[PDB]
Ligand binder design. Structure first.
Ligand code: FAD
Ligand code: FAD
Ligand code: ZN
Ligand code: ZN
Ligand code: ZN
Ligand code: ZN
Ligand code: ZN
Ligand code: ZN
Lengths: 736, 26, 748
């Protein structure tokens, strides 16, 4: 009766042939009432259709068996076609031989596996056999448009992490079926926002833009992207390359060819964005994580802090030419550990991780075989001198203080920037207004415990509460924050900082004085006259130094940026660390990771409010404490010897009922007056806005870029926020 | 308002879900 | 010798204390002791008794450590001899039932107070064995003097530990929390699915939820003295809510509350004194004793202190009626003046179809959890139907759009809204742009960036999602804001099932209006509050007066300025009123001799209709099956967006024909019968409504709702769906706005 055509509109199939070949009356390449279209290079005859579809045929059992399982796991509707693509369509594997690399179709009964995909060779000279002509079409754009059903991956690595989702809604086959506790990559249905979480079923904003061709049929994209994440978080000590991905892409049909071709693009995109192949991973040497297209551009990174060392590490790993200039005689910036204490590291700067889940710091800790100590919940407030505050008094003041913020939280609603008041001035107003309208007032102790919590919030903003914004003091929690444990990074951030810096072109004692981005290319001059130059410059200097204008810009920064830079505030705290002959606090503290210090008066509320037990093992005896709020001001006139005395006084008070030994070693920080830092971390000043972080992060003419904690709106202040900002900018700088 | 939608609810554009960290939590 | 001791603590009104314990054989009694332990201003226990339970070698250590272990595995607060004494050893105090006596008495040491004892207690009664008559008068014995101290303000502050209730009704609803953090004893231990009053740890926002361990804002302002110590309040409030949602058909009263306040010591006296103030706050605010519940004559829900005031209510819709039933129950004079010749307003059911009630207006309940409509359904024994999630998009004509094409275009549409949410970040009111103008701009600006070419089918399926969005805003997206189109979702919305109120909202409306002084056909034309009290004058001239006044007219009527205000409204309000939009949709219902759609529909509570073009996209986009029992055969559909204007000159015969023209397209494989009955709403042209539900106009802000809801000189009050920021548009919102204003009016 001849030889038939496909009715499927726009089909390049001149001579369709049946792949199924399951029925006896198989049309093969001949005639059959109707051809069924899966793709432009794959059809099956109507006689094989009946073979499975009809209840009186022989393939009915195998179909209905699959049909039941498919309606129990998935959400997509079973059909003769869906069955073919998931069960019968021949697998396509590429050849291992570097000289060949041809795409071959396997025999109907062969079941492709990762092992087969790793070693496959033509005829397993077979390599000289001509490649199937259908393969070449796979690369054309219309090919995937004339596919009927999206690819569904088998035995995806992401499978165990996506059991809360219908397999089909995440690009997996509804006919299928020892990782770090801090690696929670995907959201879960009904979960509340948590930092660095991607939705398995929806494409992020970035993703849509980079890959608009998938905006209509995204199933394949989600499928591959979730496969890569699962692979990376399964082993984050190695660089994830397309090769170690392919053997895990197990789908039937010519569509697989399209998957392995695209996985390379999605792998390189995510890599650029810092989703993977990030952290402390190194390489080392002629094995750059990006193709040679990104390599031919240079960049100067100003500042060897977390933010600068992050971008440098990334760009260097990509294969881009990077050189970082640091003013100090050491890297680390506001990360500076003191390793002189016997059997313990103590941070003069950062040393705490606020929320480990998904945190880059937790990932980097994994790569480094480093462990973190989780902080305990209990922190007794010790008065002067001896008595341990009654929990009923503590909870009640923690509650009240929290309610004061609650009423602030409501007062702020609808208020504009011009209607802004100091948080501290507002907390007082409300706190007073209560006593009035209530009648009863607080005891000396209750008032003193409320002062403890005020200082705890001054410690967090780095400032006296009368200088911070009521409307924006916590602006950043509009967004999802890092969940999970708060940990004391026992080995110290310096371990991480040195690893990132290892092998990079770092120039110490190179304070940048002028950045000229007027001409073809940006000229960066240091204080003595040294001249550097690259196509891109990334400044990561502290907020204070940008306000001070220590670096000359030509052209000068826009009146906007300066306004945003001056809208934030350079918060400051200081640390003091003391080593003793023995742990004298054990009796009273009882292995608690820290105790409190109830302020005798409001003024003294910043002075050593919290004391940290710097040994999670509890073998050594070192104490660290903090000077915040109003106290940092009244300590810059004292010298080291004096601050140490005011601290010993406090301790012998808190421990009045006993002797406390004389400290055998100590240090007192002077960040506030460190010429190249002059701060601890940013905060929003009254009248300011959180938006400022995003304005400072604006790039200038795509030539000058900014990073640092004071540019991370979502997560400001932290080494995490600073690190992530650096990853953010390297991504922008390396954009084709 | 999205809220009046019954059949076929649009899901895009929503602000990040947020949770109240109580201390009376287990 | 060395007779008297004293108390160690600051402010105690007792220098020669007596011990209540009576534990140790060597109890110091009123005599001397090493140290007195302060529990309150009328409760101290000596150190000999302190040692009885504390020292490992005494005769109570075994009872104390047994309790201590249980306390540490259930509670969060530290186990102490003072906590033990207050949770186990303190004598219960119970108030006499005799109406003429009502004295507070201490029970004997070993007596365990139960609700049954508290209910029927009388002076000198021994709960041991049953009432045998006696010849001795215990009700003339002087009440213990410490009972009067209890009600002095300072008394509570000098209570060392918080009152932890035993066997609270809320215990089951708070098993997620440590008992002692929600005002219950660590040593302790069939509702409507839609009643979930208490936030659960880790739960996201859901409307009308209270935190069991945190006082809300208005609770702080109402009871400031509890911002320092909130424990007792939270204990009683969680009990009240626990009782209310345990029995929502009865008025909850102080009498039936008390027997459930079980706590040792004098503090109980303070609890039963406070539970009454708290119970009246809950009522005025509408947290409890609200809904369809009717009170009368006789048993007004508030003390007569709130009673001496009169208020006039303009408009008898869900709003005006909600506030009416409330102020009525409180014991306040209420006269409501409606314009039309019927009650309900935008709630108007049609009960003329066979075995089916169809609503000319509202009839859907959007999220049922904590919804007042679900409560009012429990109170009325009414049941609802939950919408299925399946909604097939039928084209013209007969083809059910391919799931792959359907999902595809749902993704893309939602994506388009994701980027609209991005652009809008940090923009000001002045930088506002029409939502639709932004989605178009973003839509083309994307087809550009990638050669992706949408088919006429994909492009039409997208139109359905634009019309769906117009159906909810009741407006063309080119008039709706992009910044504030979903302003309200900034707040916590009503979770749970979306349902179809089968009996119709009319039921709940007629039950609220039952017995209220409702003047019909009395359109208000002028309101004068420039004098001592307000003067309301109708269009025919009929004059009314009252101390207050609550207008609940539709938004559209405030923009037209139907009512003369003297003095006129503030220039600010006028701006807030006009910055919001008067949305509009129209409904159409058709009855058929038989269900002709069951074949292709297959139960789906509805089916969608893929527009041929972007001009006919609001013409019957969705078709609802109005019989959840799938027995009868009625269909309801909606006209929204630009389509409501293309139908405002036509008559019903014309609309019917355009609706039949589509049904026969959607179902080409079959003969569709002729509708034996039908109706086509005209809410646009209804003089005293002129709208469906409000939205936010380009350049506007959801803050406008609050500005409208601002009272004036504490005299004129406002309510309606256009005055409830959190929940706009809905009957629920209109209802809650009524309650809200009832509260305001009752305070003044
Ligand atoms: C005492 C203290 C405690 C802290 N506690 C914590 C904590 O517990 N957890 C936490 O996460 N974070 C903490 N922080 C904050 C955290 O350290 C910072 O947020 C982070 O280091 C900032 O990163 P950075 O890269 O942006 O800047 P930096 O660390 O500040 O480094 C900036 C670099 O720029 C250099 N620079 C400045 N000017 C020039 C110039 N002109 N030319 C060249 N180089 C220049 C500086 O020398 C420095 O090397 C703490 C900080 C301090 C000081
Ligand atoms: C077709 C349609 C479908 C809807 N769908 C739903 C739905 O599914 N779910 C839902 O929750 N909501 C729905 N709504 C909206 C819901 O009905 C309204 O939000 C609610 O009725 C508004 O309440 P109201 O009290 O504020 O005003 P109204 O209901 O509008 O009543 C106002 C009253 O004021 C009266 N009035 C006006 N002017 C005067 C005057 N001058 N003097 C005296 N009285 C005056 C009016 O006559 C009316 O009685 C729908 C509405 C319509 C029209
Ligand atoms: Zn065949
Ligand atoms: Zn074909
Ligand atoms: Zn080969
Ligand atoms: Zn005693
Ligand atoms: Zn006392
Ligand atoms: Zn009596």
């Amino acid at each position: 009766l001849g030889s038939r055509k496909c009715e499927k509109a726009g089909c390049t199939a001149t001579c369709p042939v049946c792949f199924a070949s399951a029925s006896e009356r198989c049309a093969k390449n001949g005639y059959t009432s109707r051809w069924y279209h899966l793709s432009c290079g794959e059809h099956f005859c109507n006689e094989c259709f009946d073979h499975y579809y009809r209840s009186h045929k022989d393939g009915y059992d195998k179909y209905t068996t699959w049909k039941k399982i498919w309606t129990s796991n998935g959400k997509t509707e079973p059909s003769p076609k869906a069955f073919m693509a998931d069960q019968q369509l021949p697998y396509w594997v590429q050849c291992t031989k570097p000289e060949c690399r041809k795409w071959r179709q396997l025999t109907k009964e062969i079941q492709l596996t990762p092992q087969i995909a790793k070693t496959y060779r033509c005829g397993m000279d077979h390599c000289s056999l001509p490649e199937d002509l259908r393969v070449l079409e796979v690369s054309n754009h219309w090919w995937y448009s004339m596919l009927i059903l999206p690819p569904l991956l088998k035995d995806s690595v992401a499978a165990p992490l996506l059991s809360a989702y219908y397999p089909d809604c995440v690009g997996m086959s509804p006919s299928c079926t020892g990782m770090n506790r801090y690696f929670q990559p995907f959201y879960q249905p009904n979960e509340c926002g948590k930092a660095l979480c991607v939705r398995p079923d929806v494409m992020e904003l970035d993703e849509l833009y980079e890959f608009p061709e998938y905006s209509r049929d995204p199933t394949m994209y989600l499928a591959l992207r979730n496969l890569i994440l699962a692979l990376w978080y399964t082993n984050c000590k190695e660089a994830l390359t397309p090769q170690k991905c392919i053997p895990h892409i197990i789908v039937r049909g010519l569509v697989r060819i399209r998957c392995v071709q695209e996985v390379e693009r999605i792998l390189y995109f995510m890599t650029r964005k810092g989703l993977i192949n990030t952290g402390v991973l190194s390489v080392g040497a002629d094995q750059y994580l990006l193709p040679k297209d990104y390599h031919n551009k240079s960049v100067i990174i100003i500042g060897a802090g977390p933010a600068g060392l992050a971008a440098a590490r990334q760009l260097h790993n990509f294969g881009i030419k990077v050189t970082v200039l640091e003013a100090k005689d050491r890297i680390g910036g506001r990360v500076w550990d003191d390793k002189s204490f016997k059997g313990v590291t103590v941070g003069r700067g950062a040393q705490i991780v606020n929320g480990c889940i998904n945190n880059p710091v937790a990932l980097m800790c994994e790569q480094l075989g480093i462990s973190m100590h989780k902080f305990g919940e209990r922190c007794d407030l010790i008065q002067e001198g001896g008595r341990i505050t009654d929990p009923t008094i503590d909870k009640r003041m923690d509650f009240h203080f929290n309610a004061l913020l609650d009423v602030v939280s409501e007062w702020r609603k609808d208020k504009t920037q011009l209607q802004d008041v100091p948080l501290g001035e507002k907390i007082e107003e409300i706190y007073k207004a209560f006593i009035k309208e209530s009648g009863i007032q607080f005891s000396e102790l209750e008032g003193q415990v409320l002062q403890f919590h005020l200082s705890n919030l001054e410690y967090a903003c780095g400032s006296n509460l009368h200088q911070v914004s009521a409307r924006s003091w916590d602006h950043n929690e509009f967004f999802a924050q890092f969940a999970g444990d708060h940990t004391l990074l026992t080995p110290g951030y310096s371990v991480i900082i040195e690893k990132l810096a290892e092998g990079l072109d770092i120039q110490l004692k190179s304070p940048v004085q002028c950045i000229d981005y007027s001409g073809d290319e940006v000229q960066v001059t240091t204080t003595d006259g040294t001249g550097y130059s690259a196509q891109k410059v990334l400044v990561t200097v502290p907020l204070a130094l940008l306000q001070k204008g220590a670096i000359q810009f030509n052209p000068p920064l826009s009146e906007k940026k300066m306004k945003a830079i001056n809208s934030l505030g350079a918060g400051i705290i200081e640390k003091i660390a003391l080593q003793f002959p023995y742990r004298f606090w054990d009796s009273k503290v009882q292995g608690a990771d820290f105790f409190g210090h109830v302020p005798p008066s409001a003024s003294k509320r910043g002075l050593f409010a919290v004391f940290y037990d710097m040994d999670p093992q509890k073998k050594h005896s070192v104490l660290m404490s903090v000077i915040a709020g109003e106290a940092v001001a009244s300590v810059r006139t004292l010298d080291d010897k004096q601050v140490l005395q005011q601290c010993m006084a406090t301790l012998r008070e808190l421990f009045k009922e006993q002797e406390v030994p004389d400290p055998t070693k100590y240090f007192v920080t002077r960040w506030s007056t460190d010429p190249w830092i002059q701060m601890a971390y940013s905060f929003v000043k009254t009248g300011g806005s959180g938006e400022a972080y995003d304005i400072i992060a604006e790039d200038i003419q795509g030539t000058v870029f900014f990073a640092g904690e004071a540019t991370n709106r979502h997560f400001p202040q932290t080494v995490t926020g600073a690190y992530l900002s650096g990853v953010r900018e390297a991504s922008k700088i390396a954009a084709f | 308002a999205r809220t009046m939608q019954t059949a076929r609810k649009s899901t895009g554009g929503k602000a990040p879900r947020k949770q109240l960290a109580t201390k009376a939590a287990r």
